[PDB]
Amino acid sequence: HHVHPLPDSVPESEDLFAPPPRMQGKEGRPKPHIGPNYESYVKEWAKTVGPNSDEWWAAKARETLDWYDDFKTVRAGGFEHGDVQWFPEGTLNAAYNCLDRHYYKNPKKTAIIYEADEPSESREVSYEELMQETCRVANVLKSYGVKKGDAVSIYLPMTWQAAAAFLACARIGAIHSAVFAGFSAESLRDRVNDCECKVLITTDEGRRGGKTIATKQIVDAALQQCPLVENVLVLRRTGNKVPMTEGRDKWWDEECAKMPAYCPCERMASEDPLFILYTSKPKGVVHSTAGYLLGTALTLKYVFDAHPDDRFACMADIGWITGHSYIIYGPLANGITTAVFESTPVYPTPSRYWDFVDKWKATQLYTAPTAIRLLRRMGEDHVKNHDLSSLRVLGSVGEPINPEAWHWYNDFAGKNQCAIVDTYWMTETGSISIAPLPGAISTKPGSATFPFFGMDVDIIDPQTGQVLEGNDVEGVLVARRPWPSIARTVYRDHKRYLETYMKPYPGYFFFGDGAARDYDGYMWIKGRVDDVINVSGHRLSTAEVESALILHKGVAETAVVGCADDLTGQAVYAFVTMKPEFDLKATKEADLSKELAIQVRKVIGPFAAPKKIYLVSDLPKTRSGKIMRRVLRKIVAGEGDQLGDLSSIADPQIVEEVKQKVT
Amino acid sequence: NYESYVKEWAKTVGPNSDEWWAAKARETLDWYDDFKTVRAGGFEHGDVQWFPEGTLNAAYNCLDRHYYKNPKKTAIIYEADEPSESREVSYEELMQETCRVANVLKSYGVKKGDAVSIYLPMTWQAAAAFLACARIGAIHSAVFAGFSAESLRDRVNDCECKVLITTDEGRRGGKTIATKQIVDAALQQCPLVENVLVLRRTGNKVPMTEGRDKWWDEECAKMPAYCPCERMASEDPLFILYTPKGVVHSTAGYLLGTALTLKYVFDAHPDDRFACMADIGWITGHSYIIYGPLANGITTAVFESTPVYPTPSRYWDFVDKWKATQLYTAPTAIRLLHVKNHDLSSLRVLGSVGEPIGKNQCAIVDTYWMTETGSISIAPLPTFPFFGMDVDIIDPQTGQVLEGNDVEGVLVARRPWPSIARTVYRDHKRYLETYMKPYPGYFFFGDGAARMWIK
Amino acid sequence: VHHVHPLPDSVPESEDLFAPPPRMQGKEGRPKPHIGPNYESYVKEWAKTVGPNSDEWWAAKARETLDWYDDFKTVRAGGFEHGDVQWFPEGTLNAAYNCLDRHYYKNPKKTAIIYEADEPSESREVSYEELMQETCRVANVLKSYGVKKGDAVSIYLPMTWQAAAAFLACARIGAIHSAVFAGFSAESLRDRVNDCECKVLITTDEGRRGGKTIATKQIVDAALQQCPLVENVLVLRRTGNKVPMTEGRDKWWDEECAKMPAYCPCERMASEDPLFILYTSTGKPKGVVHSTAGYLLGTALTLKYVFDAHPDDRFACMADIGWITGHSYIIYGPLANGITTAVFESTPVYPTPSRYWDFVDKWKATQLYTAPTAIRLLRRMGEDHVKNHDLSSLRVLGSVGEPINPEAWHWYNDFAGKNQCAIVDTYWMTETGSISIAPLPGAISTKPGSATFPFFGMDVDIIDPQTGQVLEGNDVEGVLVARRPWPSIARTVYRDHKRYLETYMKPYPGYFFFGDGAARDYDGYMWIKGRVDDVINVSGHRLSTAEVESALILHKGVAETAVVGCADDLTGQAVYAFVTMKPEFDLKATKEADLSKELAIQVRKVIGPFAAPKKIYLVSDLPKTRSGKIMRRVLRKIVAGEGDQLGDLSSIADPQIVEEVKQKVT
Ligand SMILES: CC(C)OP(=O)(O)OC[C@H]1O[C@@H](n2cnc3c(N)ncnc32)[C@H](O)[C@@H]1O
Ligand SMILES: CC(C)OP(=O)(O)OC[C@H]1O[C@@H](n2cnc3c(N)ncnc32)[C@H](O)[C@@H]1O
Ligand SMILES: CC(C)OP(=O)(O)OC[C@H]1O[C@@H](n2cnc3c(N)ncnc32)[C@H](O)[C@@H]1O
């Protein structure tokens, strides 16, 4: 075969994982929405793509969401000019679908499990309570002159009221723009200025992992350079003294106390913007309303097999698209219970996730490979002595999951009784693009497997621009047709949207990731196109080399970048982090580096073996867990003085250590 | 009989009452969009909801739909302060004037959800001013024309309106109210008011501030006599009424309440001539001069005078002149009133309201309610709680209901009703503390009662 | 014999009735007419559209013709007296959705606009997809400026195809566009920009017309010096030549639109929400306001029936979008019907007088719609420019703007139509929204110079202006009035409803007053013969301008004429005639004094002794508006010695012509 699976210590013949009994309708669990095999996935998927898929999408849109006005047209527009339309004539409101309609059915049902930074302060928030808070905030925003179509910046940490702030904007047709709490004043300023908002919602302080985030202090520094912001609504999360500017700044509780606990919903067109979400100039990805909401609702239902009484635990942050789609919009649109997790995976101890799961009997868990590798690094004593049997689906999002970490997830979090859904997508796709349906698909460690409903993906040969038909092909991932939750533009920069996604391969949407489809038709997304390394004509994905390195005992996490080489074009350079227990005296660093290189050579080939290996205490990462290989690539290339605004990455101090180790 | 008012009332209260209420809302009002949910929310947090997904317009229900059916029908019997100056105002004329004023307001930049203060005496154009605001989704705040400059200022400032509708002068009991003079005094300390629309009721010289002040007639003459109706959510606010606390009523529930009570408590019929002698500056004039009668498409009276001008026979002269079919007044006026040789036979119902209190023919209906209730809550049907009203007696010393008959305590309501006030403008905390906290789970009217007798 | 006579013609009356020709009979593979084949087929359908039982027809047509977001309940209400006309009031819709989206969803690649550039070689087809995308981009730009539903937006654009996108972007978001003829003076632009109180103006750097540059941005800058409310100007880069741009206020159309997505939601408009203000040229500028559903329905129905438009037709209205004709029969009517419409950027004589016909044969136009002034202009230029063309794709030729003299009607019929097209003489006004009286080409046998019969929904009569009373029967003459509102009637004059009532509704209470003299002949055909204010009363004989001007043009060498009245001690008024001759006419073989005698004799033979002009002035051209109306008021006041009280003539087609006329009279 030309395409190989991501390196794994398990033989390929023993590495296929059928839906386990918890996902077979056994063990008293709900029967899966799609099952029990691959063909059941294909039979339904075939209804969602192609020239006769309007019927399926029209029915799903009308069955899944409540509409004030019906639509007539299912879809129109396309990539070339960026005029994608779905259900254009219909009207709806996201807050109505995420709150009102469920409150009218079961007001006391839990909407949010609020897992506070300190475990003792966690509590359940009913749909009634969440709706009331959302309506109060919406009324406050209207009193500030916020109109349909106005942008509102949100700089809130992971307290449950973040959901109320999102949905209060959606309720009145405002466009919320959420910024990770803890982003520097500079990063906040750039995003507040770009969306041209006049109102900002924030906290006095945030709490995360027992640390205080001085949000109001950061807001005050940023707003000195944000001339349009005239109103700041400040949630009293900690109660510590913070500055408050007379007139501009008001307290959330004092303002909401003046307002009624119900607010009508603004009737939104399907294509009215729902939010702007900046990714790392800052790129404001814009999603509209109906198509995005439908995509998050359908993917949540089908990829995680969500049922009415499920308790869904997405442990990400609402500053990330993962939090937009699979904390707030998806779970609440489905009317189930969703977790707002305010802490870190290791506060107070690395048992936190699992204490949380057993306390609330979470039925699905969704996190990132960085968190899985972090907990794997800390040892099994924190997870082994838990129940965790309420879980039946474990999800991974953010980057390729190394098969080694996949197995740890499968073995310890799931006890070999959960389906693992490796979900590939992007901020720009709105909802999950490629993922196993857990009641249907037998999984391979490291493979997203098959495309979701409405996603028709192909592999293009970047040297020819042509689609590679069939299986056992490798290249760059593209999508053939629009899908309902695709981002509609980049805020006030449609040209950047067209040039980034629609022009590289005309006729297609360009994801920016390298991908392969193996002989069984499974899709493998193996890293960013910009991270590919070419050694003596061999094209290397980051995931395959990083997956080989972690097979060595004691390795916690690695990142590989290319460095120019006069004789091989590029050479692989690897940054490697070891588990805390690994003794760098019994195995001197030079001996360990040799073993790591040998391991890569045996599993991939000599061309992939790192020419140099740097042992570091940690890797530069974004708040969401992405490993910033561009930073490492520029440091190795001697361009460490031209890196840009890294002030809001997870730990800026790590960039200095890496610079020292390389020098 | 008892088995008639109680048989029907059982369908309007309790866990099976949504069916009755959905049918009446759909029979009684014209809707642009249908509702799905009948009711939601409750007293505790003040999130009462009725017909939330529906859309409608109060001006469409009080003017347009009747104008389309019978444009020449009299909407308002305008009984001027001088009896000789009275005249009938047709639904066509009222709708045209309402639309002109609505177009004037839009030309000032009044948007859906904006407050507009109204400082008008009892001339028929007061209805046009109310319904013009409702037509465009503005929130009118009516201020009784007998209020001083300070009381006017306080209410104008509290609601943050940018527009005020008033008159040059008012005429009541043969005397002149210097309304524009009072308005100018008030507006010296009202920094948000940018436009004043001044109805020329007397034509006597009054001060007018260039730019800020314009004449009603001259502004309306520039505008077309039709204006589209803003499609309002059932729970969009309809008006603020300061009682200073701004009692806020929403649209669909309030309008349904007034229309049903008017039809049942007063047994209205399509060609009736309903004469409520109250003032549009108070809820009685809101509900049973303007919104109740015009929603039903009947004829309503706008009485500009006093009970004793020119003489104490004025009420009975008015009833004989117009053949009024109902007469709704307070005991205060009915006691102050010269009634011997009058006919008064056209009257089918004599209503009383506002305080504890025909000659063998016209009925006597004693109606209890409050500004916060929107429409009549307890009354006899020609006593007995109205449809949707489930009231109980509670001992204040225990907070417990005094089940039975011969008990005495405070009056409370069990569940929300459609026309209940939804908040106190920008002071929801006061709304909850006043009405919802004294007896958790109940609505606290604030008066005593015993069995039903209202103390 | 008859009291009412046809407009003077050299063809005998018995040979002057033209039945629908074979191209309009469903033969030769042409589409079958929507109404046909005779007068009775028109009456049978027309009778459903007027009277007390016509709600059914109008409700069905409104629901069949337009896409609605919300249905209506009431068909019509209101009336003339107070100006509260309402049609389909409870319904909601959007004009851009009906003109773009619904057709784009059906056939995105169908041509929406044939853009005939000033230079023929630069012309191209603009698909519904491209037009919708550009409309959506502009709509998004306007929203980014804070334009809200109900805000006015001024448009000062020449006849480039993007003018349609600018109109429809305003309609898409519920803004009220106010389009001003490109080339109007800074003073005229200022007055209209200030009256509508807009805060946004859309224009070009420059326009191109007849090989000439229109300094649109320079004019805008001059005007905006006196327009304190305008905060944003969007400038279309039509030529790319250097023009001033004010930092902050002014932005380039292409740079702004490139930032925006190519789709924009449609604002759900009430039937009676204003769609546009259109200013017309005697006092202050008159902003005629049209609402949405009735206007759109009227333009859609008249286009379909008066021009017998079918799905694949290529409709060529050669007017300007600054004129109501361009509003209704370039943009809204044709695009609502989903067909192809022409945006003609040039003049009838650039590069040569063959332009119209080169255009028709190049694009295979199926209908042509222009004005008598253009027809008379091409007539004066000779037959070599039209004779050697095909023109067989045409089957309907339309004329709008003024009475068409039978002499010009025949030239149109003979050379443009080759006696195989139906001629539709369409009478209406800015204030009527859509065509009011016109032949239905598959049904009505035409008379040269007659509008013939009223359109669906139009119930018209003749009032004797000397009595104020309706004249019953046929063979009557007086002033035209309408008995009942129709869906596309103007709803007000912007912020001046009193002027609307006093101009149209007060002169003849109970009726709508058009302001034109009219006659209904013995066959019931309607003749619109000139403005009431232009009637000339000589010794008790009331003379219409059209009849005398039609008699004069029967003389060899006459190109165009205008007659006005001047007080006369012996006849009350006397006829004075301003005459333009063809360039080739030898004015020395026939001296000016000699020609006048022949003209007077011809008018006497054809009309009567009283109609002979008392004085005749030879002029090189006549004062005319941009749209072709002859400004007889200007001539009338000059003859009356009142040339110093003429008003704002800065924006007429040729202001210099007024100076010559003053000289000739002096
Ligand atoms: C949802 C959230 C992660 O979106 P973004 O923050 O916009 O980042 C999107 C980018 O992340 C990477 N990626 C995310 N998931 C996976 C996965 N399962 N397998 C492989 N690569 C994955 C890709 O490079 C993608 O372009
Ligand atoms: C409708 C209008 C009067 O409302 P408000 O002006 O808010 O005053 C309401 C208050 O008036 C008094 N009341 C009203 N009706 C009656 C009645 N039938 N018998 C005895 N007392 C009555 C009560 O104290 C009530 O709470
Ligand atoms: C549509 C556009 C021309 O409207 P306006 O520019 O408002 O001018 C309207 C005026 O033009 C004249 N008129 C237009 N058409 C004809 C015609 N066929 N026969 C005779 N007179 C006609 C009339 O005097 C009309 O009042």
Automatic annotation (TrEMBL), chain A:
The keyword Ligase applies. Its EC number is 6.2.1.1. One of its GO terms (biological process) is acetyl-CoA biosynthetic process from acetate. Residues 1-34 are annotated as: Disordered. GO terms for cellular component: cytosol. Keywords: ATP-binding, Ligase, Nucleotide-binding. SUPFAM superfamilies: Acetyl-CoA synthetase-like. It is an enzyme of class 6 (ligase). GO terms for molecular function: acetate-CoA ligase activity; AMP binding; ATP binding. Residues 544-626 form the AMP-binding enzyme C-terminal domain. It catalyses: acetate + ATP + CoA = acetyl-CoA + AMP + diphosphate. It comes from the Eukaryota. InterPro entries: Ac_CoA_lig (IPR011904), ACAS_N (IPR032387), AMP-bd_C (IPR025110), AMP-bd_C_sf (IPR045851), AMP-binding_CS (IPR020845), AMP-dep_synth/lig_dom (IPR000873), ANL_N_sf (IPR042099). Residues 52-98 form the Acetyl-coenzyme A synthetase N-terminal domain. PROSITE patterns: AMP_BINDING. Belongs to the ATP-dependent AMP-binding enzyme family. NCBIfam families: Ac_CoA_lig_AcsA, PRK00174.1. This is Acetyl-coenzyme A synthetase. It comes from Cryptococcus neoformans Tu259-1.
TrEMBL record, chain B:
It catalyses: acetate + ATP + CoA = acetyl-CoA + AMP + diphosphate. Residues 16-62 form the Acetyl-coenzyme A synthetase N-terminal domain. Keywords: ATP-binding, Ligase, Nucleotide-binding. Its EC number is 6.2.1.1. GO terms for molecular function: acetate-CoA ligase activity; AMP binding; ATP binding. Residues 64-417 form the AMP-dependent synthetase/ligase domain. GO terms for cellular component: cytosol. It is an enzyme of class 6 (ligase). It comes from the Eukaryota. GO terms for biological process: acetyl-CoA biosynthetic process from acetate. The keyword Glycoprotein does not apply. Belongs to the ATP-dependent AMP-binding enzyme family. This is Acetyl-coenzyme A synthetase. It comes from Cryptococcus neoformans Tu259-1.
